[PDB]
Amino acid sequence: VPDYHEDIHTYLREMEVKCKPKVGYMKKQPDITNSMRAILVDWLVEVGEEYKLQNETLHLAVNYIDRFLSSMSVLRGKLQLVGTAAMLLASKFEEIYPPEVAEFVYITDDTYTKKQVLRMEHLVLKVLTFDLAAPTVNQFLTQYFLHQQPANCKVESLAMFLGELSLIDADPYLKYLPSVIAGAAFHLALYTVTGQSWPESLIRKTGYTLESLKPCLMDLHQTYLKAPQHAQQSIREKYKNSKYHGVSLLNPPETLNL
Template identity: 25%
Template sequence: MKMEFDLEDPLASFEEQQNCSISELFACESDHMPTQDCIFLRCEAVSLISQVQFSCNLDPFRTYLAINYLDRFMSRQEIKKGKPWFLRLIVISCLSLASKMTNTPFPISDLQIEGCVFEAGSIQKMENLILGTLEWRMRSITPFSFLHFFISLAEIELRDPSSIKQALKQRASEIILNAHYDIKFVGFKPSIVAASALVCASGELFPQKFSTVRASIVACEYIDEDTMFRCFNLMQEMKRMEPKHAAFTSFMSTETPVSTECAEKEHQKKENLIFL
């Protein structure tokens, strides 16, 4: 069964959805969200996924998708405490499903978590339970599905838009990936997370473009400004916990017109940004 898909374009491979509009993505994004009910075991489960990602050097987008499945499954299926092996089986099954969805086969033996070794049959049964619980909605609508749309809103106002778009998208993606591990962002819609991440990225990389990007995104009819304001502030707090200058590591590794000296100056300015 071939199910490869792109997180940025989740419905692209469905013929009937080839002309899917952005309004349709906004309309159905809530169906792909977890609920607050999954909080009590989430930290442990996400920690287990992080262990596998580190030990197996997994693509961060694959583990992102696995956490998405995990959140949504635990929102709909009661997970009883006192059975740590059961949570581990769920984690491995989510990672296995994410690997299949991204068409990146991975030996089940390499996905095993220390202290728990499951047979392929047990993992397959859990996969089927997850698929049924999620009603086979595995092409998740995530914040990555909205990045291109929000960037396009501000594109007309940006100079040298191609290089700025690349930088904004890359840094916003990093912020989204980091936010996915934090329980505080579980309640925000994917579109709100995407919009907030881009505003954060613009203030960090191009402070002179911050007002333009912010105004363009806030003006979007699908965005609630107060909700975005709360998400933006949480992201600012999260970024302050990052190692100094870590945000510029991957950004500066790409071909952009911003020099290291300029990046340092922009980094110093970002603390003065205010979301009005």
């Protein structure tokens, strides 16, 4: 039911610029680092697996943490509290049955109280000025999947896997917009599984070509190649499941010939 597919795509293109976190905020955070953010995101992936949350919920929580950390300075002992409140808010917005607040308190293993989680929920709302309907890499992937000739379940789950891996590493992925990361992950998944390339119908839709996706794609390729060694491994483990066709132990292509 494509009467609004293009109006929606155009509108998400406009909103991802407005929802974009500030590219160099980590260099303004006194106490926390890219690697500390990687550890937090990897943990949120584990939480999403434990309560069987949608992937979209994960992507939204991360967008909320990056936009919150873009204007709020946070000590390392409170980074998990911000990530917990963001995951609670993303669950409320996106899930049919979000986990209850006590479930969020319990999975911080009592590092925080329920009162602190609820006070932080409110602070995150005020900081983000209640603007939680942010475009994600996942929302662009799902629209790109419709251009597949024929549809390939391995291609979809591997593009989701690559898009997810980009959540962990603020450097380099905070420079790229959600739509661009999705274009690189879709092309990379497709080339890895079928040999095919970013289709011409998506150049017409998006305006992106392999040359404009090139910088992101070179970054994503390296992330893919190096995934087995990265200190964070919860996404590769999650993508070993049959629910995602076991795509994480597909072999990455050695070169992309671009």
